[PDB]
Design a protein around this ligand. Sequence first.
Ligand SMILES: [Mg+2]
Ligand SMILES: [Mg+2]
Ligand SMILES: [Mg+2]
Ligand SMILES: [Mg+2]
Ligand SMILES: [Mg+2]
Ligand SMILES: [Mg+2]
Ligand SMILES: [Mg+2]
Ligand SMILES: [Mg+2]
Ligand SMILES: [Mg+2]
Ligand SMILES: [Mg+2]
Ligand SMILES: [Mg+2]
Ligand SMILES: [Mg+2]
Ligand SMILES: [Mg+2]
Ligand SMILES: [Mg+2]
Ligand SMILES: [Mg+2]
Ligand SMILES: [Mg+2]
Ligand SMILES: [Mg+2]
Ligand SMILES: [Mg+2]
Ligand SMILES: [Mg+2]
Ligand SMILES: [Mg+2]
Ligand SMILES: [Mg+2]
Ligand SMILES: [Mg+2]
Ligand SMILES: [Mg+2]
Ligand SMILES: [Mg+2]
Ligand SMILES: [Mg+2]
Ligand SMILES: [Mg+2]
Ligand SMILES: [Mg+2]
Ligand SMILES: [Mg+2]
Ligand SMILES: [Mg+2]
Ligand SMILES: [Mg+2]
Ligand SMILES: [Mg+2]
Ligand SMILES: [Mg+2]
Ligand SMILES: [Zn+2]
Lengths: 138, 99, 208, 124, 151
Amino acid sequence: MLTDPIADMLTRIRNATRVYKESTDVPASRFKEEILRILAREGFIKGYERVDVDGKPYLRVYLKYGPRRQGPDPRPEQVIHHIRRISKPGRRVYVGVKEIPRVRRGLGIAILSTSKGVLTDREARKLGVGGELICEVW
Amino acid sequence: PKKVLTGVVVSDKMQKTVTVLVERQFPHPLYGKVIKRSKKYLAHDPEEKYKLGDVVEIIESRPISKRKRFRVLRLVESGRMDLVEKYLIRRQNYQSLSK
Amino acid sequence: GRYIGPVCRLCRREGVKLYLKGERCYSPKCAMERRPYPPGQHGQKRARRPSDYAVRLREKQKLRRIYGISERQFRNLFEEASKKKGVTGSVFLGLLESRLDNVVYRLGFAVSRRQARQLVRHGHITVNGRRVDLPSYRVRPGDEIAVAEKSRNLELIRQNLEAMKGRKVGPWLSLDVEGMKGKFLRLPDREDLALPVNEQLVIEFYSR
Amino acid sequence: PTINQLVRKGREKVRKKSKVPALKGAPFRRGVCTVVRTVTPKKPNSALRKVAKVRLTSGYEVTAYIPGEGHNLQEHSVVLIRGGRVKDLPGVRYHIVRGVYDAAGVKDRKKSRSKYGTKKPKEA
Amino acid sequence: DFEEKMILIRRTARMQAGGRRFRFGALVVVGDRQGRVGLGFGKAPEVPLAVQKAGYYARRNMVEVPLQNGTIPHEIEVEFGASKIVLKPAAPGTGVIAGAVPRAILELAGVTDILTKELGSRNPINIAYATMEALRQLRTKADVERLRKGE
RNA sequence: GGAGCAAACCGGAUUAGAUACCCGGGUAGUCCACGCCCUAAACGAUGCGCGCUAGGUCUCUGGGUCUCCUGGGGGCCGAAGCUA
RNA sequence: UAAACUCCUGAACCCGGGACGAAACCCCCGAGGAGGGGACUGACGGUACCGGGGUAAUAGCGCCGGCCAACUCCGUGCCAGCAGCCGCGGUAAUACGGAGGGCGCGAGCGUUACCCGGAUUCACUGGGCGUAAAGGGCGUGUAGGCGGCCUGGGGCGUCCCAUGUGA
Ligand SMILES: [Mg+2]
Ligand SMILES: [Mg+2]
Ligand SMILES: [Mg+2]
Ligand SMILES: [Mg+2]
Ligand SMILES: [Mg+2]
Ligand SMILES: [Mg+2]
Ligand SMILES: [Mg+2]
Ligand SMILES: [Mg+2]
Ligand SMILES: [Mg+2]
Ligand SMILES: [Mg+2]
Ligand SMILES: [Mg+2]
Ligand SMILES: [Mg+2]
Ligand SMILES: [Mg+2]
Ligand SMILES: [Mg+2]
Ligand SMILES: [Mg+2]
Ligand SMILES: [Mg+2]
Ligand SMILES: [Mg+2]
Ligand SMILES: [Mg+2]
Ligand SMILES: [Mg+2]
Ligand SMILES: [Mg+2]
Ligand SMILES: [Mg+2]
Ligand SMILES: [Mg+2]
Ligand SMILES: [Mg+2]
Ligand SMILES: [Mg+2]
Ligand SMILES: [Mg+2]
Ligand SMILES: [Mg+2]
Ligand SMILES: [Mg+2]
Ligand SMILES: [Mg+2]
Ligand SMILES: [Mg+2]
Ligand SMILES: [Mg+2]
Ligand SMILES: [Mg+2]
Ligand SMILES: [Mg+2]
Ligand SMILES: [Zn+2]
């Protein structure tokens, strides 16, 4: 039944990016869209569309990756080095404003739901609000 | 402002008195995860109007008796025994713990 | 106070020429010019690579010994340094300099700091009119670090005055050699300073 | 442990025994000698060490080791226990402060006096 | 012609009839003091040679250190399987606050204001490798948007 | 209930000794009915559920025009990854 | 350079002067009010401080095998003793005791006691469980915890703003 839709996707993304798969699906949701709509905005994904699989709504997340590499191991750098859910279902995280993280000194992003949207560390910050720290990526 | 609470009535066996149970919720001081605890309040009801399974607003009030410092404000919905179901079940697993 | 004992002796452990002595340390003999090695039965034998400890240690003992100052006092200043904003390594030193008995040296009214302390302590100096004798006295910017009336025409005062003619000193300072008095322009920049000491290594040791 | 677990059970607050029961919080305690005698050391050593059982103010009663070359401790000497174990010997969890009461310091010792109650001699 | 200082120099030993025969190991760090660094490990039947052997793999091995007024672009936790180690940037006037090992690696790397501590095994050797491969992951605001852009 | 086996037990032998190993004999027990005991290297020394992430090989079982696709088990080798 | 020696300074000590802390209640104008003016009162204390004279004028404790800064000589010979742990001493001891020397810190220096740290060694931050300590012998289910997709009502958590409070 899945306990958490969200970190499930992020996992999808994660496991995917690790073998470099071009794109990989994930059941559709108003919310995951919104999550991704930021994965795009900030350039972690190339993008996503409400692709179908057997009558069932999904999303193609088209994964961004580094350039090839020189020397031992032609391992492309990684557009998404590290993704991990924060506010888990078993333990809700609810940061006020002056409490939002500073992910890896700026380079990092921190999504999070809010009464005025689905903003980010700076977007919600500058906007001047607080909400459920969805997760951080960098 | 005289604090007020909604909790379900959970016993009517008293003369002009009623047992009201009220779950609050809040986050654990170290573990955050919102946790749930509850307390019973001894409400006054001079009209003996409210019956079991009623969900009620309860107001901080002048002391009526040793345990009554609240009075029934107003109904919120009649038929909700399913909740008293729970409070009874809980109170019954106890009897199977002793020695 | 200051280890009154043998002092042209520390120069020898640190291994750097240190100016606790006045004339003599400039001569051929900071203790060091004749004996460049550490004190004691040994020290003339092949030393060994100071553990990361010894280093951070001995560097501290250097910059401290240079001011001939109370460890408790030092230690305190080091901490006061972290108390306030900016780069601690600098202000520590900048703060060390504000010490009155250090000014009557940078302003040269004496050949040594230990000498400098005597005069300061003996009421020989003054500031804006009052006969300060507290070596500790933190000099804020801009104050007549003059010399006192009973004192002006003093024997060892002049011998340092007639020797103090010309010879520019301290970009963060100014000396009215004639009126026998100086000014604290501003707080000694790091560049304005030049000590045989790595400030960054002294902070290290003050984390243990 | 899930958090729900943590919320339920919780982390067991560690706790430690006091390697020396001298007194409720006392730094030392005044004792009195009963027996006084040499006792052979443990596993890798051997050398007839100096100890004494010590009837306590605290009603207790225990062995305490005696530091330094030679002692004036007789079968009644009032004494002061400082308490510090001794890998060498079993049961001895306490040391005896040379320098106080019938704890006379050591004679002829020049180094690290303090630790052995001896005053600083004179040269003249 | 880089600056050079060895970390630890140990004497392991193997067994064999008649007796035991030994060898020695030398961990060495190496750097310019403005971003070039490289530790390398070498072992030879004798000290000098063994140190020398490091001096080789030392210079041989290397890595770009994206400094920043002497600190670093952002913190990193990195676990070399057994050992973990955390580097965090710091305002100037702080220092090389870190252990024996991760110290040198950072100092002979031109660093001067860094908050760092080990966790898990504090094994010199293993922490060593961890500290390098740590550094070898720091992305600069540039390195970042050079990937996030892909244009 | 009781054939065979078989702690305990008896005898033979081996041994310095042999309350053992080997041999001859032997009783509870092993079997059943009912009732109790509730332990184990009760082992994959791996809690259950759910989604993710190469393939190769043989094997049990089911569906489909069927030198092979599809589902469920049982194995060995191994992507990445984990791992002291 | 330590001492000696030369020079310069001048804690202590002696002489002189010497408070701030205290302007009110209390007295006349007015009105016993507002407003001004008028006087007494200091335990500390002839101390603080200020001027004059003026003598070179207390150093101690811890350590020096590794961690941990700081080496050698003698005595001792698993004895005498050391110890926080690893350990040291059974003729050649930088590990015992004395010495010279050195290191640290100085009117303090050590010891003991207890609290936090190191200890990510109760782990929320931040831990684990195939063999290192750790999966319940296996189910079935009560409470509890956790819960898929979309529209909408309330807004409990949650968030933001102001306001009282936080002496
Ligand atoms: Mg600071
Ligand atoms: Mg700043
Ligand atoms: Mg039986
Ligand atoms: Mg098995
Ligand atoms: Mg395998
Ligand atoms: Mg691999
Ligand atoms: Mg592999
Ligand atoms: Mg794992
Ligand atoms: Mg002199
Ligand atoms: Mg002299
Ligand atoms: Mg003379
Ligand atoms: Mg005077
Ligand atoms: Mg008078
Ligand atoms: Mg009157
Ligand atoms: Mg007088
Ligand atoms: Mg008088
Ligand atoms: Mg006084
Ligand atoms: Mg005077
Ligand atoms: Mg050393
Ligand atoms: Mg002897
Ligand atoms: Mg010897
Ligand atoms: Mg030896
Ligand atoms: Mg010795
Ligand atoms: Mg020792
Ligand atoms: Mg702790
Ligand atoms: Mg802790
Ligand atoms: Mg945890
Ligand atoms: Mg563990
Ligand atoms: Mg099991
Ligand atoms: Mg709604
Ligand atoms: Mg509304
Ligand atoms: Mg406050
Ligand atoms: Zn000199």
